[PDB]
Amino acid sequence: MSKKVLLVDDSAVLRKIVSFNLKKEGYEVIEAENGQIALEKLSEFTPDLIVLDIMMPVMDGFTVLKKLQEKEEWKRIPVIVLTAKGGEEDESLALSLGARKVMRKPFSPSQFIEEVKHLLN
Amino acid sequence: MSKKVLLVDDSAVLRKIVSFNLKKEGYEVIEAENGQIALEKLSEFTPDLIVLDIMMPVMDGFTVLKKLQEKEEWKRIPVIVLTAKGGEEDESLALSLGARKVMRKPFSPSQFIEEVKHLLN
Amino acid sequence: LKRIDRMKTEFIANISHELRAPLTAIKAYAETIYNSLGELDLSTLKEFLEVIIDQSNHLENLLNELLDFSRLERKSLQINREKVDLCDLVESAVNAIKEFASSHNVNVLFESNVPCPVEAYIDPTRIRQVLLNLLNNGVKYSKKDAPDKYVKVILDEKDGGVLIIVEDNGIGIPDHAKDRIFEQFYRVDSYEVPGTGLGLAITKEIVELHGGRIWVESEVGKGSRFFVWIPKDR
Amino acid sequence: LKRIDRMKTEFIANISHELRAPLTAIKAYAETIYNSLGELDLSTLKEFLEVIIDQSNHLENLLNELLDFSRLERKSLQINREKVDLCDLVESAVNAIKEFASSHNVNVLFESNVPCPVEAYIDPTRIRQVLLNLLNNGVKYSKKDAPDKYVKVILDEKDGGVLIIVEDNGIGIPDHAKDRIFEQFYRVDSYEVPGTGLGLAITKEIVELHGGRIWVESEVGKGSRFFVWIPKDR
Ligand SMILES: Nc1ncnc2c1ncn2[C@@H]1O[C@H](COP(=O)(O)OP(=O)(O)NP(=O)(O)O)[C@@H](O)[C@H]1O
Ligand SMILES: Nc1ncnc2c1ncn2[C@@H]1O[C@H](COP(=O)(O)OP(=O)(O)NP(=O)(O)O)[C@@H](O)[C@H]1O
Ligand SMILES: [Mg+2]
Ligand SMILES: [Mg+2]
């Protein structure tokens, strides 16, 4: 009865260290290299928590957020935005697009997992 | 009997990582926080290889090199210069002041160790 | 009349100076742990790892100064005010830098001439950066040869607003440069000290955006004192 | 009149972009190893350590680019010539990029129309930087994800000097931007691609200091071909 997490980012170097620290807590990891692939995986199941990058090719993280608050089957999914953007414009924008929390890069892994558990409860 | 080297640098963080890799090959490490202290510890004994920083408080590395190749007991001591100053003229000046090799920061520990073993023959 | 372009190119070499030292530590300590796994006890392994993590935070400070510099040119630096206890916020800042000052031996004391709590309508994140910036400068530029080295903040409430003081026994700012220390890129040139000149410029912008001012009173050799006045703005 | 100050500040922000990604990796991997020492198998431990060393070398390339930028301003960059077999020099550069190329799915070639050795009085250190720069760009701005991605190096000697061509299946340079990519800080801003802008600027300086010149032939979608001509010497 473990939880599954949808990890979305364009850098495999990031997805490696995040999939490791997520599986540390007994979670399942489903990766996606861009935002379009992330939506293609969202049709096969429904994740418990989504980790979303903003700067990505093909489909960025903003469009994924709008399409998450659209289809009412995903509108109640907690979304964490792990982006390199730091301006107050980008954070408040992702917040209005249905995201629960936005964390800048670089990020502390202990604080990230702490927020992942705070949203999974 | 084990070899002895004189480690000269103002950064205690660098002295530790160089003392480790120098002791990894079986050498004895004698630290000195600046160039003036290095000359003081040059009175208790005579090392077989000296690692010298350039930018140091009190006494700089160029002054240590000039004081070295003018006193006979210190003239034949091989000296590697591990400096952050990777300038064009900085290398040629230290080489003219009697240094046997000038290495730049950041450096590779394996490359630096192999050069230490080169001068110790 | 645009000599500012001449000062920006020096800011480049200052970035490379701030980047050259922690990169030497990250590269050396990482290759050491790799090629010397069998020559590491668990203590030195964690010690080398923690040295790697400490240098990344130095570079993280360098990254955040480049971003806040981009916000001073954009003039887009904004404050988000909360109702924060001041003595609580200054304790959280003094607690953090206590360990860094221990690596260079400096007693970080905190006195309050007013009774805690001291609530105010300020941004806790940027004010904490102001505190951590003034305290990082008080310990770094503190004299080396000296016994009982200290740096003390004082909470006070003068002229309606809140007056914070940061005293230290540092080397002291000369009477000719005490005006330009707040201008961008400016630094008291006197050896291998890393710096970019933006610490007090962002500190000045944060305090003045809060509705107040900041000035400095220091003596050559004796010590340095920074003053920060901010209204409560309830 | 003086937009060089404007193009310099954008290059400042480019330094922060180049610093943000490897720092996030160094911070994440070095902190995972520190907290998960009891959960890291030796394969993942060395793999995470290997990532830290790789990202530190990415930042080391950033440090050396800022130092070389400080040499283009002072006009202090000099070359130190020595008779080096060019075949052994290019074969030493296609292998120092072959691993980084296989990561981004692309291979290197070397079709020399003249039999080796090819001795020339050049600076092998700076010319290796010229080759590694054109190869790294031949794999960074390569094709989107098309089949058969390669980067070719053609050694030749025409018009009394040595002529090298770096071919690739890259995205191609638009004809409106082909006459300014060598200008400093310039970059065809057509997303998640790191870019400083002065990569070809240092490449142009090294080639012109060697006595020769360098130009570019490119078509949109067809690929890119950089031409470097350096005379032989005594
Ligand atoms: N507590 C102090 N005592 C004596 N001198 C100081 C003190 N704080 C600052 N100064 C001087 O004033 C200048 C302040 O420059 P600043 O704007 O802090 O750039 P910086 O030194 O690069 N800060 P940072 O980037 O955070 O290390 C420095 O050149 C110091 O010499
Ligand atoms: N092999 C290539 N194929 C297509 N375009 C290229 C190639 N090499 C360079 N360019 C173009 O040249 C422009 C700038 O290149 P350059 O001056 O080297 O800066 P840079 O590559 O961004 N900096 P760095 O990668 O850090 O050295 C980019 O906008 C590219 O589009
Ligand atoms: Mg990204
Ligand atoms: Mg030093």
User: Whose atoms come closest to the Cα of D24: which ligand?
Assistant: 3
Residue A54 φ/ψ region, left for φ over 0, alpha for ψ in the -120 to 50 degree band, beta for the rest: alpha
Q: Which residues pair with C20 in a beta bridge?
A: none
The residue among D62, C25, C38, D23 whose CA lies nearest residue B109 is C25
Q: Which of residues 24-43 of D touch B (CB under 8 A)?
A: none
- CA distance linking residue D126 with residue D130, whole number of Å: 6
The interaxial angle of helices D86-94 and D124-140, nearest 10 deg, is: 40
Q: How was this structure determined?
A: X-ray
**How far is ligand 3, taken at its centre, from the CA of residue C34, in Å?**
28
Tally: H helices and E strands in chain B: 6, 5
In residues, how long is chain C?
A: 234
Instruction: Give every CB contact of residue C217 below 8 A, 6+ residues apart in sequence.
Output: C225, C227
* DSSP conformational letter for D133: H
- State the CB neighbour count (10 A cutoff) for residue A118: 12
| Short-list D24, C74, C68, CA closest to A103 | D24
Residue whose structure tokens are 């490791």: A20
Inter-residue contact B28 to B49 (CB < 8 Å): no
Residue B100: CB atoms within 10 A of its CB come to 15
DSSP assignment letter at C48:
H
Strands (E), D2-88: 82-85
Q: Are D182 and D200 in contact, with CB atoms under 8 Å apart?
A: yes
| Residue that has been written with the tokens 């292998």 in this structure | D95
Resolution in A: 3.6
Q: Find chain C residues with C-beta within 8 A of D34's C-beta.
A: 46, 49-50, 53
Q: Rounded to the nearest 10 degrees, how much is the dihedral formed by the CA atoms of B14, B18, B19, B22?
A: -170
Ramachandran angles phi, psi of A106, nearest 5°: -70, 160
CA C175/CA D101 separation, integer angstroms: 57
Enumerate the β-bridge partners of residue A4: A28
Are A106 and C60 in contact (CB < 8 Å)?
A: yes
Short-list C41, A84, B11, C32, CA closest to D52 = C32
Rg (chain A; Cα; Å): 13
Q: Do A87 and C76 touch (CB under 8 A)?
A: yes
Tally of CB atoms within 10 A around C227 = 18
CB-closest option in C23, C24, C39 to B24? C39
Q: How far is the CA of C57 from the CAs of D8, D30, D166, D212, in angstroms?
A: 26, 11, 39, 44
Q: What is the 3-state secondary structure (H, E, C) of C99-143?
A: HHHHCCCCEEEEEECCCCCCEEEECHHHHHHHHHHHHHHHHHCEC
- Sign of the torsion angle spanned by Cα atoms C157, C158, C163, C168: negative
Q: D42-74 and C4-35 helices cross at what angle (nearest 10)?
A: 150
Which amino acid makes up residue C73? E
Nearest by Cα to B52 from B16, B88, B103: B103
CA C114 to chain centre: 25
Question: Residues D40-67, buried b or exposed e (16+ Cβ, 10 A)?
Answer: beeeebeebbebbbbbbbbbbebbbbbb
DSSP character at residue B80 = E
User: Could you give the dihedral angle defined by the CA atoms of residues C91, C93, C95 and C97, in that order, rounded to the nearest 10 degrees?
Assistant: -150
Q: Cα dist. B66→A84, B39, B95 in Å? A: 49, 12, 11
CA gap B26, D133 in Å, rounded = 40
The β-bridge partners of C119 are: C85
- Determine the distance from the C-alpha atom of residue B33 to the mean position of all C-alpha atoms in its chain, rounded to a whole number: 12
Going by C-alpha positions, the residue among D143, D139, D130, D70 that lies closest to residue D103 is D139
Instruction: Using DSSP bridges, classify how beta strands B4-8 and A101-104 pair: parallel, antiparallel or unpaired.
Output: unpaired
User: Residue D24 is inside which H or E element, if any?
Assistant: helix D4-35
Q: Which three-class secondary structure state does DSSP give residue C155?
A: strand
Nearest to C162 by CA among C214, C217, C126: C214
Name subunits touching B (3+ CB pairs < 8 A): C, D
Q: Which residues of D are annotated as a binding site for ADP?
A: 133, 137, 140-141, 168, 187-188, 196-200, 224
Q: C60–A87: do the CB atoms touch at under 8 Å?
A: no
The answer to whether residues B86 and B56 touch, using CB atoms and an 8 Å cutoff, is no
What is the dihedral angle through the alpha carbons of D34, A101, C71, C24, rounded to the nearest 10 degrees?
10
* Binary contact (D63, B106; C-beta < 8 A): yes
Q: Give every CB contact of residue B73 below 8 A, 6+ residues apart in sequence.
A: B46
CB contact under 8 A, D13 and C53: no
Q: Is the dihedral of CA C9, C12, C18, C20 positive or negative?
A: negative
Q: Which residues, in sequence order, are CB contacts of D18 under 8 Å at separation 6+? A: D62, D194, D196
Residue nearest to atom 23 of ligand 1 (CA): C199
**C79-234 belongs to CATH 3.30.565.10:** yes
Is residue A26 less than 8 Å (CB to CB) from chain D? Answer: no
**C144, C148, C153, C156: CA torsion to nearest 10:** -140
Contacts for D50 with CB less than 8 Å, ≥ 6 apart? C34
Residue (of C20, C15, B82) closest to D56 by Cα position: C20
Question: Quick count: other Cβ atoms within 10 Å of Cβ A92?
Answer: 11
Residue C192's contacts (CB-CB under 8 Å, 6 or more residues apart) are B10, B55, B56, B57, B84
Specify burial of residue D120 (Cβ count, 10 A radius: 0-12, 13-18, 19+): buried
Ligand 2 centroid distance, CA of D205 (Å) = 15
How many Cβ atoms sit within 10 Å of the Cβ of residue B103?
18
Residues of chain C contacting D19 with CB distance shorter than 8 Å:
19, 59, 62-63, 66
Strand pairing class (B49-52; B4-8):
parallel
CA of A34: which chain D residue's CA is closest? D192
CB D108 within 8 A of CB D114: no
CB C5 within 8 A of CB D8: yes
Angle, CA D124 vertex, CA D123 and CA D125 arms, to 5°: 95
Cα angle vertex B72, ends B69, B73, to 5°?
105
Q: Would the CATH topology of C1-78 be identical to that of C79-234?
A: no
* 8-state DSSP, C180: G
What span, in angstroms and rounded, lies between the C-alpha atoms of C133 and C139? 10
Nearest to B52 by CA among B23, B75, B88, B18: B18
Contacts of D44 in chain A (CB under 8 A): 20
Which numbered ligand comes closest to the C-alpha of C226? 1
Domains observed in chain A? 1-121 (3.40.50.2300)
* Amino acid (1-letter code) at residue B98: G
List the domain boundaries for chain C: 1-78, 79-234
Distance CA A7, CA A23 (A): 12
Residue B60 C-alpha from the chain's centroid: 12
Residues in chain B: 121
Task: Tell me whether the omega of the peptide bond preceding residue D22 falls within 30 degrees of 0, making it cis.
Answer: no
CATH topology of domain D1-78: Helix Hairpins (1.10.287)
Q: In this structure, what token pair is assigned to residue C147? A: 């016994």
CA distance C177 to C12: 22
Look up tokens 């409106």; give the residue. Answer: D176
Give the type of residue at C224.
S
Cα–Cα distance for residue pair D81/D125, rounded to 1 Å:
9
CB atoms within 10 A of CB D100: 15
